Amino acid sequence: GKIEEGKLVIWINGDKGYNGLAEVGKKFEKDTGIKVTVEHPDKLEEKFPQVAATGDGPDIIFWAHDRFGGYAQSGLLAEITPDKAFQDKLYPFTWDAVRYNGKLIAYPIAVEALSLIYNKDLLPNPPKTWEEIPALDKELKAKGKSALMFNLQEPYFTWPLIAADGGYAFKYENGKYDIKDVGVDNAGAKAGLTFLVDLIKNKHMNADTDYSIAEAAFNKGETAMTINGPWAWSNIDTSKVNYGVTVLPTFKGQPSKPFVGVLSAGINAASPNKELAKEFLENYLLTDEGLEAVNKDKPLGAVALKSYEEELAKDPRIAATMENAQKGEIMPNIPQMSAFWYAVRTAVINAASGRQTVDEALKDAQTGSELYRQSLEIISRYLREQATGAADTAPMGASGATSRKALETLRRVGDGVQRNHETAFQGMLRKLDIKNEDDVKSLSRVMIHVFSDGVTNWGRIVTLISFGAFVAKHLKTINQESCIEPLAESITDVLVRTKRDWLVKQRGWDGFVEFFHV
Ligand SMILES: COc1nn(C)cc1C(=O)N[S@@]1(=O)=NC(=O)c2ccc3c(c2)N(C[C@@H]2CCO[C@H]2[C@@](CN2CCN4CCOC[C@@H]4C2)(OC)/C(F)=C/C[C@H](C)C1)C[C@@]1(CCCc2cc(Cl)ccc21)CO3
Numbered sequence: 001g002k003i004e005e006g007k008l009v010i011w012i013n014g015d016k017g018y019n020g021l022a023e024v025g026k027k028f029e030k031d032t033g034i035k036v037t038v039e040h041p042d043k044l045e046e047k048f049p050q051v052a053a054t055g056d057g058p059d060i061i062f063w064a065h066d067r068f069g070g071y072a073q074s075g076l077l078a079e080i081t082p083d084k085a086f087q088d089k090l091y092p093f094t095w096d097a098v099r100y101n102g103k104l105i106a107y108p109i110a111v112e113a114l115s116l117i118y119n120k121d122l123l124p125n126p127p128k129t130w131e132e133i134p135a136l137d138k139e140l141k142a143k144g145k146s147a148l149m150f151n152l153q154e155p156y157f158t159w160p161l162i163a164a165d166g167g168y169a170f171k172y173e174n175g176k177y178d179i180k181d182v183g184v185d186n187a188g189a190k191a192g193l194t195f196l197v198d199l200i201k202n203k204h205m206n207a208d209t210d211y212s213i214a215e216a217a218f219n220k221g222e223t224a225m226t227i228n229g230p231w232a233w234s235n236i237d238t239s240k241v242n243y244g245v246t247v248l249p250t251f252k253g254q255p256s257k258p259f260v261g262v263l264s265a266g267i268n269a270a271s272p273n274k275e276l277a278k279e280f281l282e283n284y285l286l287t288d289e290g291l292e293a294v295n296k297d298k299p300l301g302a303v304a305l306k307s308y309e310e311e312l313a314k315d316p317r318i319a320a321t322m323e324n325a326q327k328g329e330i331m332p333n334i335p336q337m338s339a340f341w342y343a344v345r346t347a348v349i350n351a352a353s354g355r356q357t358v359d360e361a362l363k364d365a366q367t368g369s370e371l372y373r374q375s376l377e378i379i380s381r382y383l384r385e386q387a388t389g390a391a392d393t394a395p396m397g398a399s400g401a402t403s404r405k406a407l408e409t410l411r412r413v414g415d416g417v418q419r420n421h422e423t424a425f426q427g428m429l430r431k432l433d434i435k436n437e438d439d440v441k442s443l444s445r446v447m448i449h450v451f452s453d454g455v456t457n458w459g460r461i462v463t464l465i466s467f468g469a470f471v472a473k474h475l476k477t478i479n480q481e482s483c484i485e486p487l488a489e490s491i492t493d494v495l496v497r498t499k500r501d502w503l504v505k506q507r508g509w510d511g512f513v514e515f516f517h518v
């Protein structure tokens with residue numbers, strides 16, 4: 001479809017101040033005659049990449065910054081180019097959250113971190129440790145109350161505990177992420193998640209508790225504590241619960257480490273209203289009055305706009321938010337975050353329900369989180385060595401035995417496919433007529449159509465990759481060697497995105513090696 005000209009459609013999550021945002025839209029309309037429509041669809045962060053890929057969707061999308069690198073990598077976002085005067089009005093670390101491959105890809109709005117929220121009438125002093133919560137629940141159950149209820153369906157809420165004793169997503173050292181170094185199934189992560197599962201086993205929490213259940217229980221005074229962000233404070237105010245916002249409990253003497261989000265506003269690359277969107281965001285929303293309108297609906301947290309943040313920073317709930325933020329870590333925005341989150345969401349749900357043990361659940365989450373990088377390493381190396389006739393001497397890195405053995409297996413079975421199907425490979429190569437970087441970009445839809453819609457097995461995966469190597473050899477011959485790495489990335493994307501669940505079920509590339517073991 002085509003995004004309509006002369007209006008703005010905005011998407012924002014249903015937990016945020018969308019009525020306040022609509023009020024800013026009405027002010028925009030008053031000046032310009034342009035109607036602003038604010039919507040809060042379910043699963044908007046999943047919807048957006050689907051609809052935007054076809055040139056459809058909202059003009060402006062709001063989400064935490066972690067999803068935006070994926071959207072940008074997919075060509076779904078307009079580059080943001082504010083002048084120095086405007087840039088200097090927001091905190092530099094907030095612009096850093098929305099920078100991807102050296103370009104600004106959204107406007108930052110506000111810094112979000114989870115805090116412990118407690119009912120002062122039930123618990124005059126909140127617990128400093130996770131370890132004391134079982135005893136406190138036992139005390140409270142004798143009064144017809146519980147200690148703690150929070151959303152167990154979204155890993156954002158359980159991550160602070162998983163991270164506390166050493167769980168991590170992608171290792172960060174010397175100002176750099178090692179995307180090859182994933183910390184989901186280490187001893188620290190296991191300790192955190194085992195503690196959560198034990199809370200459930202011992203009937204201190206219920207695996208089925210979700211956002212709405214926890215919110216209602218806290219706001220009705222049935223549970224003494226919850227874990228939530230600034231957006232939740234409005235409904236708690238309405239409830240008249242005597243609440244405090246404080247630092248999350250420690251685990252094994254170490255701080256809980258929330259993953260810190262920057263609510264951000266991106267502009268759809270397919271929007272014909274980009275100048276209207278820029279005007280709205282810079283001169284209506286990111287002003288004291290614009291942020292106030294949203295904040296009075298549902299609190300934003302620590303806003304990116306220095307002038308308004310100076311007012312808000314006096315609020316002890318914001319101080320608490322920022323204390324927790326400083327103990328946590330800013331989320332990456334790398335495209336791999338979506339997969340990391342899906343993998344950890346499934347692990348927590350399965351461990352909490354008893355569908356899998358903690359060890360089983362975190363193993364699968366490690367494999368899912370490593371899948372893209374490991375797949376790319378194997379596929380890129382095979383294509384490149386096939387094209388040039390010489391292997392890559394660089395170390396395989398993390399899970400290197402698997403990568404090496406997968407590459408050796410792929411050499412055996414993939415060369416066999418190419419050899420036996422040479423005429424068919426030649427025919428398809430000529431039919432596809434691949435000449436340059438632009439023609440390579442067209443192959444994804446063809447790969448999805450042919451590969452992803454057929455039967456899922458290792459044989460057809462070998463064919464996918466083997467035909468890729470055949471194409472790579474051709475590209476080298478015609479002085480298009482620079483196209484090979486983009487080709488490898490494209491094949492990897494199709495494989496891992498469309499066969500994610502199947503691949504994890506096979507133990508990823510270890511399953512491949514096992515399947516073709518001679
Ligand atoms: C015991 O059995 C086996 N052991 N082992 C080890 C393998 C098998 C086995 O049987 N495998 S098999 O079932 N696999 C497939 O069929 C298959 C799987 C994935 C594919 C993939 C195909 N394709 C079409 C092929 C390529 C050459 O001619 C093709 C084919 C079959 N195709 C199927 C789709 N139709 C659509 C209409 O036009 C004709 C076309 C024909 O042609 C005969 C072929 F060679 C199949 C042989 C496979 C080995 C059979 C390539 C593809 C689409 C093109 C773009 C593009 C680009 C890159 Cl970079 C990379 C890939 C692609 C997607 O990836």
Ligand SMILES: OC[C@H]1O[C@H](O[C@H]2[C@H](O)[C@@H](O)[C@@H](O)O[C@@H]2CO)[C@H](O)[C@@H](O)[C@@H]1O
Pocket residue numbers: 013015045064065066067112154155156157229261341
């Ligand atoms: O649970 C995984 C989920 O976490 C974060 O989403 C948060 C969001 O940042 C908050 O603003 C609020 O809406 O709660 C969400 C959790 O339900 C990530 O931003 C998101 O990408 C991820 O899927």
